[PDB]
Structure 1
Amino acid sequence: KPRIDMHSHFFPRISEQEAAKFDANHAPWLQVSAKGDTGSIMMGKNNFRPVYQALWDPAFRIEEMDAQGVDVQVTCATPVMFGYTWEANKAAQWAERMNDFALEFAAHNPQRIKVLAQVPLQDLDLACKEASRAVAAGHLGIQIGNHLGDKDLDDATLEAFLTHCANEDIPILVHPWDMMGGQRMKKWMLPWLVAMPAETQLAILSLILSGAFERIPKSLKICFGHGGGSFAFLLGRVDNAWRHRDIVREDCPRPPSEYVDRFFVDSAVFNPGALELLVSVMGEDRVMLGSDYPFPLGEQKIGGLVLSSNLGESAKDKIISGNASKFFNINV
């Protein structure tokens, strides 16, 4: 039973110059210290966030995986890489380049390192083509952000994308990104603590309340990252609203709670009680170990929360290993 950690991120060796050729102001690149141990994601000439070797170096990453007890990691774009606001053809060329970097990263050891691709989701046609190209080149699926500006997952272009993926057997991880909140949540990591869980919840409900699960084939494999946000906990509020209000019930024929059999969530909720309630709502078959390696708010002892739960042995094995193996078809 190899521990599979199915939610982690990477960032490729791109220089200022290469990024500039796409967008001098908005294309992210990687600055590495002379020493080679630390670095920063840059945007234009500005420091975006500080980072360390494990995000760009697959050999260094292998050492930490050994140290952690992680046998297989699935890793994908850092969300600042998405480029969802750029011109389509440019975002397409970018996506391909990033996905190639991701394959080259995993080529260091394709047994223990699996990658998901990004897509120019602003353009449905180009997004489908990149999704297919990348999977047929080695990627085990796609990571998308959870919205495109004012477009949420109920949007016909995003629904059409999920449907293409269901049709071609391409798993999706939905990652919250580009957080709401306007001006309100600047200090103390509030976008991460408030807006992010709200974003993921909104993605799920957008699928549910629009009736989109009635249209998307049941074969779609889709996981919502970062514990599904606050979804599991406020689901009661949503069923209540659906039972008692026309406008809530209108596009959604079955109790919202019944739609949990249509998706997955990762396990990153940082609390025993939250995990227990997460597993209660979703069922043990629908929660997968994800850490958010190698960022600093990520689970520092990968799998620790699950292995130390008062869940059954049966269930623990599915969450740390079983489910993702099936979900991503990583042949154990």
Structure 2
Amino acid sequence: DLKTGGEQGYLRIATEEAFATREIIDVYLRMIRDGTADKGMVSLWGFYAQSPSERATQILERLLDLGERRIADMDATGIDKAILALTSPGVQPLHDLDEARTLATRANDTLADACQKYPDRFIGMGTVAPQDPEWSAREIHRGARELGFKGIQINSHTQGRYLDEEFFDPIFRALVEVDQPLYIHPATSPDSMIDPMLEAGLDGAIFGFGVETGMHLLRLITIGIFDKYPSLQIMVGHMGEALPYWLYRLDYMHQAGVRSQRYERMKPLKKTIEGYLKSNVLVTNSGVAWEPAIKFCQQVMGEDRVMYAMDYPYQYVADEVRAMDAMDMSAQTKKKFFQTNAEKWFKL
């Protein structure tokens, strides 16, 4: 009943879809075994790489496939195209920079090969190693120029450091050079923040992911990244990591802090936070197959700035696709949401 081909009036383009490489998962296992994994890696990957639960075992199998099985799963849910990225946390936590760069290179080449096999079904976002910003700049260019990628995904913090530090500037410089978006995908919080969430079972997708990622996007807005780089587009999933809902409070309290000189890293910005959401931030509904939240975000940010995403294989649910197809939205809005926003912002 869910079919590819666009007969219902739009293609379904899923914009936050994950894969893994066996060798990178094996590094996570090595780090867990040797005690160099952070608490988030132990929690997240200690569970999915080892748990006998149905959910974990199917996730791992699906993550690792970039071929016929993935295509069959897409076909079964009417998903025409998937924008693919190496699953969080990528190579960001790795302590050996040579290893991180080598494995990122291999993951990027593996993804490029899969997109070359299925160029009408798979679209790639590159993975990088922000612990080396200039290498990451090189890899942004290589992905854009040689591999056919449409941007990059960064899995939030790198070893507890955030992208608003000047150190990471080459990444943004390069994204603006190639004119591609950055998708800031969640990760577990760093060890500096995770403990109260971890103890309650809240460190992952239920809560901690949104804390980490919303914080990361907010700190980039408030350091002025979009004044420095006015063309830059940053995408986030999960209905904007709560920021659209918080918007009134974000702007009120941001302004209060700026005027009162409360913080060194909070100085005047050229736009309000609302202004940046309307011009520089893009959101997907990954994990949020929920009409009132989607409509809220369309209203606040503009319906051109909200895109469909499935979050395969972490949230692979045929009934969610059906619920999205059935929303009380005009045909014209629905086609933007499922297809034409992604075509614009990813330059498909």
TM-score by length of 2: 0.80
Q: How many residues align?
A: 310
Distance 1:15 1:197, change over 3 A: closer
Distance 1:264 1:168, change over 3 A: same
Q: Percent identity?
A: 25
2:37 paired residue number: none
Asked if 1 retains the 8 angstrom alpha-carbon contact of 2:180 and 2:233, the reply is: yes
User: Higher relative contact order at CA 8 Å, sep ≥6: structure 1 or structure 2?
Assistant: 2
Residue 112 (structure 1) aligned to one of 115, 121, 143: 121
SS at match of 2:183: strand
2:38 paired residue number: none
Distance 1:81 1:15, change over 3 A: closer
Cα drift, residue 55 of structure 1? 2.2
Q: After alignment, is 58-67 or 140-149 more displaced?
A: 140-149
Asked if 2 retains the 8 angstrom alpha-carbon contact of 1:200 and 1:230, the reply is: no
Structure 1 gaps of 5+ residues are 28-40
2:295 paired residue number: 276
1:209-266 Cα distance to aligned partner (Å, 9 max, x none): 1122100131x23211222211111111111113333237623233221111112011
1:147 paired residue number: 157
- Say what the alpha-carbon RMSD is for the aligned residues: 2.6
By percentage of residues, which structure has more helix?
A: 2
Cα drift, residue 163 of structure 1? 2.6
1:322 paired residue number: 340
SS at match of 1:191: coil
Cα drift, residue 26 of structure 1? 5.7
SS at match of 2:62: helix
By percentage of residues, which structure has more strand?
A: 1
Residue 216 (structure 1) aligned to one of 200, 207, 229: 229
Q: How does 1:84-123 map to 2 (within 5 A)?
A: 84-123=93-132
1:225 paired residue number: 237
Distance 1:301 1:122, change over 3 A: farther
Matches of 1:251 and 1:259, distance apart in 2? 13
Residue 194 (structure 2) aligned to one of 182, 202, 205: 182
Residue 254 (structure 1) aligned to one of 271, 295, 299: 271
Q: How does 1:29-178 map to 2 (within 5 A)?
A: 47=50, 49-50=56-57, 51-57=59-65, 58-135=67-144, 136-178=146-188
Distance 1:206 1:101, change over 3 A: same
Structure 2 gaps of 5+ residues are 1-9, 34-43
1:25 paired residue number: 31
Q: Which amino acid aligns with 2:308?
A: L
TM-score by length of 1: 0.84
Matches of 2:24 and 2:282, distance apart in 1? 36
2:7 paired residue number: none
Cα drift, residue 177 of structure 1? 0.6
Residue 5 (structure 1) aligned to one of 1, 14, 18: 14
